[PDB]
Paper text:
The isocitrate dehydrogenases (IDHs) compose a family of enzymes that catalyze the sequential dehydrogenation and decarboxylation of isocitrate to α-ketoglutarate (αKG) in the mitochondria or the cytosol. Hence, [name] plays an important role in reactive oxygen species (ROS) removal in the mitochondria or the prevention of age-related diseases. We have previously shown that under calorie restriction (CR), [name] deacetylase Sirt3 deacetylates and activates [name] in mouse cochlea. In this CR-mediated pathway, we have shown that mIDH2 activity was regulated by its acetylation/deacetylation state.
In the crystal structure of wild-type mIDH2, two molecules were found to form a dimer in the asymmetric unit, which was also found to occur in previously reported structures of human [name] and porcine [name]. The two subunits share highly similar structures (root-mean-square deviation (RMSD) of 0.3 Å for the superposition of 826 Cα atoms). In each subunit, one isocitrate molecule and Mg2+ were similarly bound in the active site (isocitrate-binding pocket). A hydrophilic cleft is formed between the large domain and the small domain and serves as the active site where the isocitrate molecule and Mg2+ are bound. Amino acid residues, including Thr117, Ser134, Arg140, Arg149, Lys251, Asp291, Asp314 and Asp318, was involved in isocitrate and Mg2+ binding by hydrogen bonding. Arg residues (Arg140, Arg149 and Arg172) and Lys251 on one side stabilized the binding of negatively charged isocitrate, while Asp residues (Asp291, Asp314 and Asp318) on the other side stabilized the positively charged Mg2+ metal ion by electrostatic interactions. In the structure of wild-type mIDH2, Lys256 did not bind isocitrate and Mg2+ directly but was adjacent to the isocitrate-binding pocket, which might importantly stabilize the pocket conformation by regulating the arrangement of the large domain. We note that because there are four positively charged lysine residues in the large domain, consisting of Lys127, Lys129, Lys130 and Lys133, those positively charged lysine residues might exert repulsion on Lys256 in the small domain, resulting in a wider cleft. In contrast, the corresponding distances in wild-type mIDH2 are both 4.2 Å, which are too distant to form hydrogen bonds.
Numbering used by the authors:
A (entry chain B): 40 to 456
B (entry chain A): 40 to 454
The structure:
Amino acid sequence: AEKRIKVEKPVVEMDGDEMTRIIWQFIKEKLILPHVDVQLKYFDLGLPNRDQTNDQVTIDSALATQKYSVAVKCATITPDEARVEEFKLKKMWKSPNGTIRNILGGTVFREPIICKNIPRLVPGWTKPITIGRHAHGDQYKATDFVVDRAGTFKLVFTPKDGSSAKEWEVYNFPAGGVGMGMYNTDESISGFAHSCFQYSIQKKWPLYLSTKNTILKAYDGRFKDIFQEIFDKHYKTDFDKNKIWYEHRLIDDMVAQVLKSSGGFVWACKNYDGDVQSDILAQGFGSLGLMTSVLVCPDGKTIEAEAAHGTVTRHYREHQKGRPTSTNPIASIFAWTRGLEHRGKLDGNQDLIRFAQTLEKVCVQTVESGAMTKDLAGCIHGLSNVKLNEHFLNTTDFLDTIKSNLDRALGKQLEHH
Amino acid sequence: AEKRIKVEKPVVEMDGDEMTRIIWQFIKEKLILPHVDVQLKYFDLGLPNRDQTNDQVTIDSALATQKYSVAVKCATITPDEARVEEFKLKKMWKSPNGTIRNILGGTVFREPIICKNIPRLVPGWTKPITIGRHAHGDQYKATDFVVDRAGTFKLVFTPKDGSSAKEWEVYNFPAGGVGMGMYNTDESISGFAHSCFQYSIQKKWPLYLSTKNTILKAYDGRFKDIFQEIFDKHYKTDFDKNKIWYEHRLIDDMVAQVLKSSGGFVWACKNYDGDVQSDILAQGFGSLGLMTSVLVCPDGKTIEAEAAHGTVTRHYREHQKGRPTSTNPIASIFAWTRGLEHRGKLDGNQDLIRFAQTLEKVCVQTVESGAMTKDLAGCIHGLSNVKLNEHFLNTTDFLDTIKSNLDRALGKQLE
Ligand SMILES: [Mg+2]
Ligand SMILES: [Mg+2]
């Protein structure tokens, strides 16, 4: 290609774990840095460094993302019991996404990456669906415990001004059990709502906020109340103007509608439902690998693009020994592209935005032309009916095909001006 | 059946609301009692009577279910803001299904009804899938509240044996917000697990418990642990004998893995997940109306077979104005059959069991042959390519067709 595109402001990079960390490197080397001059603020969120720093690098990386307004994040391991044994960890550390999302706040938007030849497990979904997952609070900022004896679990609220304290007896445990408490601010639900309406306007689509307000009257009612209050006060005229609507729905009614519908709408979820229902969407549209994830913070400027799927552990065992693999890198690629795309919007850099979009176009077209990794070929032909270099190809070979197609596609650009 | 089938012990009947209430008494009058002599213990759980009794009749029906060990429940209204204006209720009463499940406890087993002519929205699922929803606790017995000003929200556990009281600060509120707290006992999780393992063995299918124990390490971890403890102590040897397995899984891995698979397993969900994921299975397998729902208590004897779908109001307004409707009653019929089928198995009554099966086989065959309601027609032809008395029948007509086919099927049996 020509001279590299000069990016004025920096971009935070959060490095990942095991096999997603290796393809992360090959993406920077072959696709990003050859075409883009960018100042990269590095943070290693790999599990070894998190252990060494005591999960402090996770906090510092989030604070850096607040400062420079853009981050890109590779996939990381949230450690279980076996991982503490393997990595010799001093503590079973909490989810780094949880720590970051709590600090930044806002709304995780998730939508599928549409490859026209990839078959859908849900034939009904002709148009694409976007989830707006609430990034803060609920189960991901909870306080849970085990009860080993008889006792009285209660909630207590002590006002700051000094008026008398309120109390609620949750349960008198007769013997052993478990208990937990969670929360959410009005502020975070407001910023969550603003994000979902504004995205619903920009997309020219309707919005649906699912809750379970019939059971949790005070808690889930506050979601429905704040959404309806903001809709009718700010975006009522704009939805009517654009031939679209906002509605609430019951969560168990909603998941039936979605599976039955043709699609083509925004779907606002609470924190927990966003996690569960977005992995249904992804898999229904074709594959877990084909999905984006962009945490849009309430301030309007800040984002954290990231790899949707988890780390590929079994494929990492092969790369240690020096053997080939076939791991789909497209999620990691799109995390980079959406990071640069938003970097460009913030600075008015038109070349950077068009580069990002061109790379997204290429990744799709490459798969559409029958060049793909094993997991995507398994969607088409069946998982045990595919040969090496015939139906699918290796991970670095697939990246080399994208590298090649990117240069070709960038060749058709500028030459016609 | 010139003489009816006698039933030694009683059955509890919980009457419902609006349109299902109408088709409930249709089923009682012309489908059940003509062929079965069964002493029913009537409890009206309609919303007007629940207001009359301060939701006490709801409790009374549960205590009756404990005594006689079988219940059948029509669909009821969980009232919202709009219902308190309409019915002029004194208080916005809580869910009667919530109140009953809390008192009885156990595992709500939900599985689809397979009609071969109905298409599935998930082509992958060749074989059927049974969810085992946990009946008790979690969000359904939660204390939740709104926060109007700044303050410190904390939890407190005060041991009864006089040991040290523990406290956890949850959050220090700057502005307003919301907070809640919930619980679950170890005994509830045991009976839940046992019920799931016994059903998984009797089906000869593998079991999968799903949790989010990476995040809620203590709470969801307790489920993972108790299931695994009970498996290895009691059931591992019988699972191995029938070529089946138990496995834990992460919830967001499970929902992907289920949709990808071709079914044929038992899926043990927690209380909240079972509510949501059962509607995905139902809708995906064909339609919300083609779903059974049987609460199976920890003791093994007691059950409560309920109507899965809600009491759809759209159609009830047409009925009140004289016009015909097209609601699917098959759910409500299966509530009866599964009640009677269990009533028969408890008492050793082979005739009652055969009858219950015959009616289920009739409901399926009736749809498979061609006769069906509007919503089941819409699954095949689409919702706006359907003709009244061509592609579908009325609610009244459909029930008379089932009554006819039941009588002819029963009339063929005696030979
Ligand atoms: Mg996930
Ligand atoms: Mg439900």
